[model samples]
Target: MGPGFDFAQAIMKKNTVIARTEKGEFTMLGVYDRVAVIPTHASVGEIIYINDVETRVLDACALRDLTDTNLEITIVKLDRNQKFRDIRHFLPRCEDDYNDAVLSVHTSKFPNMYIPVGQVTNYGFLNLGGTPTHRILMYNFPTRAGQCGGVVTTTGKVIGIHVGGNGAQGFAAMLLHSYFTD
Candidate 1:
């Protein structure tokens, strides 16, 4: 058995959804320290809706080193005292989870979507935004663009954050070990 055997409930638990540009909203996989890590492109001066409260982006960073993937992620700093559901740590399981099931919050406002299992197609990067960098390719996973910041887990521990992907293939930002300790 893996860690966090009962993680499905906790993973889907309401953290916060990022709303910007009327384009739509995305889930916040986890909170790194006090900063909100989102899977959408956000500007530093842009106004974002966190839950129902409006907050301005104090800072945003999207780089290869920050996420270790080609996908771009924004780390936003809010001024007000915003309450967000934060994950203590991530459970690293780079290997395929064919034997186990996977879980994610399909929509930021709905219940958790449970998947039977997931497999790693390969280790490579795609031009998700700026440049091609390292990324994890997943198969048998149903992910949508709006669910970018949602968490992906097996056995209740986080494997990665849904960054971008279509119906056939889904990509995620592998939560590095440093995300917790640092």
Candidate 2:
């Protein structure tokens, strides 16, 4: 869903989750349908609102530093605590790619408003912390000010975790591959 698509419903159906703080909206990540990955910088609060539901953050892991690419990544553990049966079955499909058409969903500058979708323009390696890390570039991406997190996906399968970018471009975390495989 992008530029004229009513993706709000569809996104919810995909279990897209949102995270925010006193500073404002921060990041978004989803599927695995329960847990979401976001920028480590946005993991300042103990509780974050996920689609209006106040979920407790059981754990936060700084899987890696994103300084080189000017981005940060974090994995959040929602406090479901085995309340739901077979929760593992609901995990999202975390995929990886470069130069693939992808979707980004995040809050906009306006209160309660959001840009639920966008497209990935290209992918390449950026020197992050002296290491070459995979990065996804997007065209016409509306990057939100303040620390925010978002979900990037290729045809509904997650591909990256958005950290920051300008209107013309941005970068996402490709570490989901390591997380899933680990």
Candidate 3:
């Protein structure tokens, strides 16, 4: 799974959900009408909450990405609530040093909504699998499966989605702008 998530302060207001199962976790990005956004690899198993109330998935769209890949983002439609206020316009940034600092708003954790977890440790490809040639930001942090899909931020702007842990260094994708085309 990915290690980074974006719009830290704003994501908390979006229709995002940190779907927790017995084992892993993933974040659902937004809900408009009835559609919610998510990553390519997942299943809705347990909980979704806001203000400590029950919010959850009603249905998963019967489809996959045009082609399945780890970086692909997909949409799922979930239950509706009048309080689900969402905000757009948080532009995702991946330019420059790509920043050396970041935060994983595993809102389920830390009291600050997020904390300065770590700094960029490597620029080589994160999640060094198949090619290990495609470059992405990799950093040092105490990562866990539960942090996957949580929004990662730097200096109050979103940098990317966390690719989750594979080593003392965890992986994140500099992917928000590249993934969204509107």
Candidate 4:
């Protein structure tokens, strides 16, 4: 047959445990590209991470005029042989591995459609004043929970990471800015 799949319910159980146990140190790094269609625009690239495996069903919109659903999220398996061992070691312990210390999920094709100008983005972070780290990206697209992960330039390189909380529209926007770790 083809690749196997797991039910969302089972995946949720694993996510719950991770949310509680892990400190949310996992982060991603991608790049912006300049190409046809958009002429010097940025597209997303590789995701970089280590430790923790969370596959929450995020709700997002499709192509501005379509319905929303949970987008599938399997672990990044760029290198199959190594990916499994990494998942085994990290997903269980919420720990990091040696060579596969980081886990990365990648998008091989260009995003199907354009993100509208006013749509809020979702960025994932741990605490207040926490660094704008992981881009919540799309669990689906317009996930109220994961909508504003991080802001990107027209070229797609992340410009500002997100905070994801505020009560409501009072803080219903992103905190855009650059970041550099030292």
Candidate 5:
């Protein structure tokens, strides 16, 4: 039983969440991978917990502008089956470089959790000003209070969501949104 049980079973058999709204409970990072990886930066709405029932982000039609790259993640519609439990709805993969075995899980509160397995050193472009709108891929490990949107996977392929970090140098924005096909 090596190789971390194949990406923690490749992100716990698919289905990631940790979002909130209507008053803000946990806030952001609602990664369902199937129209469920919404990250509007401090505006992650809908519902999600991804465990023991609490998932409910049933609609995400939020698109930014200017030939979006990081803004590609704008098509969510999760139903975790958490607060319901169904298990069987995953969608993550970008193509090329699973990147040195990587992964990320953060439920912590949905009974508590947020597993972080790192590697992917760096990719490119992340200025957030007037040049590189977004196209990041930096990884080291350990991220918290990220307002939620913290998802990153490899080998199994669900690459990046969390978009901020310090000392540890964490970054993500590699065409997330259930594999970008819009």
Candidate 6:
């Protein structure tokens, strides 16, 4: 059980059901494919695996000087429909920010095919590898479970609602939030 999970059940009562069990077909139904939760990250360090060669992945932050405090982060998805299009389709419909980010990261055609839900193929993973000059990790798609939300940013400008840590990665942020509107 994680921080929020009911650890007391196993420790205190030997109970597995976390939620309050009710009388019905089921109190909690777990989705094998659907996202139980979304992906989110706070810092970067929790994600990337930077080495001498991968040090180039750092942005404004200098790799040599960076400590545990300087880690940036990105979210990971686990549920189905983890593709770029699957996340992109969700929005006001068609806008420049939505289309551009989606297109740049995933596709090139407008009115693209609708991403199938609960499909693993639709979703992959994202990577967090920036350079000393860039200062921010771009959306390196096809990311892995390890490199989701790991200390996103200290600047506090860019927000990673759910960049992924363990439970939910791709299925969480199936779509990107529009920063332009705000």
Which has the greatest lDDT? 1
lDDT accuracy of residue 126 in candidate 4: 25
**For candidate 4, what is the TM-score?**
0.23
Q: Stretches of candidate 3 above 4 Å error?
A: 1-7, 13-15, 21-23, 31-36, 44-69, 82-88, 93-97, 107-113, 118-135
lDDT of each: 0.58, 0.52, 0.50, 0.21, 0.50, 0.21
For model 1, residues 23-54, the per-residue Cα lDDT tens digits are: 56666654544476665454434676766677
Name the top TM-score candidate.
Answer: 1
Q: Which RMSD values do the candidates have, in order?
A: 4.1, 5.5, 6.2, 18.5, 14.4, 20.1
- Report residue 134 deviation for candidate 2 (angstroms): 6.0
Better of 4 and 5 by TM-score: 5
TM-score-sorted candidate list, best first: 1, 2, 3, 5, 4, 6
Tens-place lDDT digits, model 4, residues 1-182: 11111221222122211111122221222211100010001111233122333333222111111223211111122211221111111122111111101011112121111232223234333233343223232221231332222222222112222223444421111112211111
Which structure is stronger by lDDT: 1 or 2? 1
Candidate 2, poorest ten consecutive residues by summed lDDT: 82-91
Write model 6 residue lDDT over 4-106, tens digit each, in one string: 1122121112200111111111111111222211121222232222111111112212121133232222222222232121221122222111111210011
Residue 129 in model 2: lDDT: 37
TM per candidate comes to 0.72, 0.60, 0.58, 0.23, 0.31, 0.18
Please tell me which model should have the higher lDDT, number 5 or number 6.
5
lDDT of 4 at 28: 24
Name the lDDT of candidate 1.
Answer: 0.58
Candidate 2: tens digits of C-alpha lDDT, residues 113-144: 34444555446555533545544445455565
Ten-residue stretch with the least lDDT total in model 1: 92-101
What tens digits encode model 5's per-residue C-alpha lDDT throughout 120-171? 7546666642335355677676565533455565544556566656645666
Which is better, 1 or 4, measured by lDDT? Answer: 1
